[PDB]
């Protein structure tokens, strides 16, 4: 039901969003983004299941200076960058996970252990054991990266990679068959809904069957529930003071007292009413959001709290509250991520083709071309450099960036517009 | 079990400084407040200042052009300075353990401050 | 400013009387903040009521301290002879930290 995680950021992910807090409020939406999916997934064990954070770790560029730390090297591959993860003590959490701002080969964004029901280690639910080769690992690890084949990737898949990891931690193998992978069916009604979570290549934005996990998921966790959520999970409860994200019953939450450099704001060491508690004379503390500063002030009037996006103009700061302005779109139906979707409400969703009332397709060096269609009928998938199309794009091939998915979900497209699977 | 003890110099002259050393035990000045309370001869308890666990300050907003308020949290210490002393200085300056809820559960014998020429 | 308004600031009472003192406030404040805090002659204060309810260790069971938001209580069931001295109620949710004005309890012969 709960599961009291442990989240690391290394340099790279702090240096791409550019302070504490934005890297605070990525690592605060990535756990509710899988407490909403695993809570609203009906598992055996219990109907609902979700998530928290005990303790996070912000490392930042100024630890890419230390000696000590052996993530600061630029160059790590996927499977040593999660053996480093595992080889620290991590036994007063369930789970315990690293984001990073990595390019990984061959498109890998997410790894993490297996969950065995019995009979193993790995994935959810395991202590530090000795094993072999004298170091002591802890197997319930998982990594996160937020580039790939040079690309930053959206939020929205940056959410279900978490989970589709978490998934393997819970128990849970990748989707294998007609029946658990629809994407790949012969049929219409269900290649349209698309695969699952636990799919083992590329997902993006189908956003219907592949949010949640599958029949054949299911299945798999369910036995790991019924045998180590027992003597696994903790219990629900208030919202603990120290983990560095703003809960309800407290004012501010900077961390511990060797984590707290916040003049606005109690550590968690401090006595109960006080702790996570405003300190007097102050109005507002970094870590409740980005418009106020190290000054305890509500901010002052045109100040970035959200810079212009693609589909989102930019949110303002003022003395109004702690947190960002909401942002509010555009001219609807723009241009987004490189002439590929369009800006319809503030979201980068879809594809081109939509723009003139049409829908994305799988081409038949043309796969990484976007193919758009007319509406319903495959047949008439044509590419947007075609004659058919010719009227409204004029000519120009519009090409998928890199990182986009390509050859019905099988691969990625690189730099050199290949769909490698 | 939890101590205060408050080091004044007693007698000084008026325009001179002052320096009152709260010597504390049983608890770690870096997770608990310490506030110093000041008490006129026949008067009510006085507020001056406090010391946060993480070294932040709070004043008394009309004495903090005088006062000043460190620590020293490996020797257990904290330190209250003042400037240019005047008569009606004249009290006896506690200072407490600011505890669960901002409680002043535990509090110094005090020292007396006399302020005359 | 946070304003800590005792009153009465005068109280006479005999053995085995009952008394209840006040504390109003000038802007409401959670009652985990209020304590209340006894005092003699010559000696510093010792901590009485602490978060309005609850009397610190050692202080008898004749005391009690009730109030939320505004209004805050003292009240000695069975006036004792040893309860006869100054008592004021204290505020640090809001700075400054300001104490009350203080109600002088003095038995009555």
């Known amino acids: 039901n709960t599961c009291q995680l442990y989240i690391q950021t290394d340099h790279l992910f702090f240096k791409y969003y550019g302070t504490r807090e934005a890297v605070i409020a990525q690592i605060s939406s990535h756990v509710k983004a899988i407490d909403t999916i695993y809570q609203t997934t009906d598992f055996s064990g219990i109907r609902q299941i979700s998530f928290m954070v005990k303790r996070i770790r912000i490392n930042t560029t100024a630890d890419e200076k230390d000696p000590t730390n052996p993530f600061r090297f630029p160059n790590i591959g996927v499977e040593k960058f999660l053996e480093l993860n595992s080889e620290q003590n991590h036994d007063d959490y369930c789970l315990a996970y690293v984001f990073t701002d990595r390019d990984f080969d061959d498109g890998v964004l997410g790894l993490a252990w297996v969950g065995a029901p019995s009979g193993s280690s790995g994935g959810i639910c395991e202590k530090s054991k000795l094993y072999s080769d004298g170091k002591k690992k802890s197997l319930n690890t998982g990594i996160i990266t937020v580039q790939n084949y040079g690309s930053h990737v959206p939020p929205k898949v940056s959410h279900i990679t978490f989970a589709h990891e978490v998934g393997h931690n819970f128990g849970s193998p990748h989707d294998s068959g007609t029946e658990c992978t629809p994407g790949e069916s012969k049929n219409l009604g269900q290649k349209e809904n698309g695969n699952y979570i636990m799919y083992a290549r590329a997902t993006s934005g189908d956003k219907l069957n592949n949010n949640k996990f599958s029949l054949c998921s299911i299945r798999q966790i369910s036995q790991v529930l019924e045998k180590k959520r027992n003597n696994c999970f903790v219990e629900s409860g208030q919202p603990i003071c120290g983990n560095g994200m703003v809960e309800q019953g407290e004012e501010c939450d900077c961390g511990y007292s060797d984590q707290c450099k916040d003049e606005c704001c109690f550590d968690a060491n401090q006595p109960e009413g006080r702790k996570c508690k405003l300190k007097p004379g102050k109005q507002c503390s970094p870590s409740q959001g980005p418009c106020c500063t190290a000054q305890c002030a509500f901010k002052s009037k045109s100040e970035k709290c959200r810079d212009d996006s693609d589909c989102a103009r930019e949110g303002i700061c003022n003395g109004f509250t702690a947190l960002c302005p909401a942002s509010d779109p555009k001219p609807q139906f723009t241009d987004c991520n490189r002439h590929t979707q369009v800006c319809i409400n503030g979201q980068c969703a879809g594809s081109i083709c939509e723009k003139y009332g049409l829908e994305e397709c799988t081409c038949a060096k043309e796969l990484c071309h976007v193919c758009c269609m007319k509406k319903m009928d495959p047949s008439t998938c044509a590419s947007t450099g075609s004659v058919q199309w010719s009227r409204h794009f004029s000519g120009r091939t519009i090409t998928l960036q890199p990182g986009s998915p390509c050859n019905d979900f099988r691969g990625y497209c690189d730099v050199f517009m290949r769909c490698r699977l | 079990q939890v101590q205060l003890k408050e080091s004044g110099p007693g007698l000084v002259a008026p325009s001179q400084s002052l320096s009152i050393t709260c010597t504390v035990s049983g608890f770690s000045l870096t997770g608990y407040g310490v506030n110093w309370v000041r008490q006129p001869p026949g008067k009510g308890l006085e507020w001056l200042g406090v010391i946060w666990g993480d070294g932040t300050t709070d004043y008394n907003s009309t004495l903090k052009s005088r006062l000043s308020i460190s620590k020293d949290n490996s020797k257990s210490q904290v330190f209250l300075k003042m400037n240019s002393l005047q008569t009606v200085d004249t009290a006896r300056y506690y200072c407490?353990?600011?505890?669960?809820?901002?409680?002043?559960?535990?509090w110094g014998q005090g020292t007396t401050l006399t302020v005359s020429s | 400013q946070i304003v800590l308004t005792q009153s009465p600031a005068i109280m006479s009472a005999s053995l085995g009387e009952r008394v209840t003192m006040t504390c109003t406030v000038s802007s409401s404040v959670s009652s985990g903040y209020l304590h209340w805090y006894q005092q003699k002659s010559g000696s510093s204060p010792k901590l009485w009521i602490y978060s309005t309810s609850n009397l610190a260790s050692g202080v008898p069971a004749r005391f009690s301290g009730s109030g939320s938001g505004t209004s805050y209580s003292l009240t000695i069931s069975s006036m004792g002879a040893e309860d006869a001295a100054t008592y004021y109620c204290?505020?640090?949710?809001?700075?400054?930290?300001?104490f009350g004005a203080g109600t002088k309890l003095e038995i009555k012969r």
């Open positions: 407490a353990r600011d505890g669960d809820y901002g409680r002043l559960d535990y």
């Open positions: 204290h505020q640090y949710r809001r700075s400054p930290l300001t």
